[PDB]
């Protein structure tokens, strides 16, 4: 198997109280399981174990207080739990919460290792509950750790501190953790795109404007693609990645390439709405295995259309595997045609593929 594909069913126990219906459900990653075994894929793929993340390979990114307050819900009780979920910014917490955050990371974690070792080309994690929203001191947008931003970290104390590490955040939501974590770091590379509508969409800062280039030695490797006033779909995924992602990318040269892959941007999800298809992400897929030597790995975050995130995420797998890139079905919206020319008028000056 050229493709690696981590899942643990026991990720599905961190589930809401309260509100039983609130999106981030337990059934997102089993039914995009589902969707991998009737599609064939699961057989083609190799099956990496899930393990729990260390607290020490927590504090990679996260600080010894927040890494101990959610660590504490393990066995705090209902009211305790739910007066520690309104201290962040839409956060619930079970007492399962804390473990399926272990798990999720270290999935991610054994992953990377399978890819760096030559185990597998590439890889996919199905995992929950997501981590780009979290911050190094905080939960946040149902994340308690960011899983991706501890893989990239994980990733470079298995090989060397500078390893090139790309992170490609296609979420509908801005990675607002990730970009911090990594703000004056130029070994990391942090790409978003998201809905923007001018900070009037979550998590609602300027920080994921075009204009956070990054600080320090980290100026030019933040670089912030958002979207205003408008349904994007695959025609504006495509040129964004034409005109950005993908020179930027090569230029930087990453030695493994991480992607927060949320679904919400799909068609159908009724948190993003936008209508990339799963053709689109396919194409998103396949350009990004054109880089870091093929050494991708596909980790989910966001998606609550269970349909649209269960064929979106086959469809990458699908790619992963080396299958063709099936055909894609509009003119550019033109706040996206001066999204991208924003993003491109800030990022110049660093990136000579650019100009
Ligand atoms: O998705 C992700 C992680 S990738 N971050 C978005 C966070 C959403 C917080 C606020 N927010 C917006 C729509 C919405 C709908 C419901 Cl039902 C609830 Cl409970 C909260 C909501
Ligand atoms: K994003
Ligand atoms: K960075
Ligand atoms: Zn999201």
Redesign the pocket.
């Known amino acids: 198997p050229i493709t690696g594909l981590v899942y643990d069913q026991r990720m599905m126990l961190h589930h809401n109280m309260w ?1 039983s219906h ?2 981030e459900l337990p059934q997102r990653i089993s039914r995009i399981f589902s969707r991998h075994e009737e599609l064939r894929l699961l057989s083609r793929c190799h099956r990496i174990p899930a393990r729990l993340a260390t607290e020490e390979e927590l504090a990679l990114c996260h600080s010894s207080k927040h890494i101990s307050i959610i660590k504490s819900s393990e066995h705090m009780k209902p009211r305790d739990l739910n007066r520690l979920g309104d201290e962040y910014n ?1 956060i619930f917490i079970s007492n399962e919460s804390y473990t399926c955050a272990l798990l999720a990371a270290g999935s991610c974690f054994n992953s990377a290792q399978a890819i760096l070792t030559g185990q597998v080309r590439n890889a996919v994690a199905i995992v929950r509950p ?1 981590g ?2 979290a911050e190094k001191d905080t939960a946040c ?3 308690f750790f960011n899983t991706a931003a501890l893989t990239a970290r994980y990733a470079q104390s298995i090989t060397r501190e500078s390893l090139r590490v790309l992170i490609v955040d296609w ?1 509908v ?1 801005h990675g607002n953790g990730t970009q911090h974590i990594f703000e004056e770091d130029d070994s990391v590379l942090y790409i978003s795109l998201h809905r923007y509508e001018d900070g009037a969409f ?1 998590p609602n800062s300027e920080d994921a404007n075009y204009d956070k280039v990054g600080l320090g030695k980290g100026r030019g490797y933040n670089v912030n693609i958002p979207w205003n006033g408008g349904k994007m779909g695959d025609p504006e995924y495509m040129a964004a990645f034409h005109h950005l992602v993908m020179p930027i990318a090569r230029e930087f040269a990453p030695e493994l390439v991480l992607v927060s892959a ?1 679904f ?1 941007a799909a068609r159908g999800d009724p ?1 993003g709405g936008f209508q990339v298809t799963p053709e689109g992400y396919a194409h998103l897929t396949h350009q990004l295995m054109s880089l870091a030597a093929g050494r991708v790995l596909i980790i989910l ?2 998606g609550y259309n269970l349909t649209s995130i269960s064929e979106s995420m086959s469809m990458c797998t699908s790619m992963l595997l080396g299958d063709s890139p099936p055909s894609l079905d509009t003119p550019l919206k033109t706040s996206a045609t001066v999204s991208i020319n924003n993003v491109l008028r800030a990022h110049a000056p660093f990136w000579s593929s650019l100009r």
């Open positions: 509100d609130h999106p839409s997501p780009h929203h947008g149902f994340c979420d939501h979550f949320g919400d948190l975050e966001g």
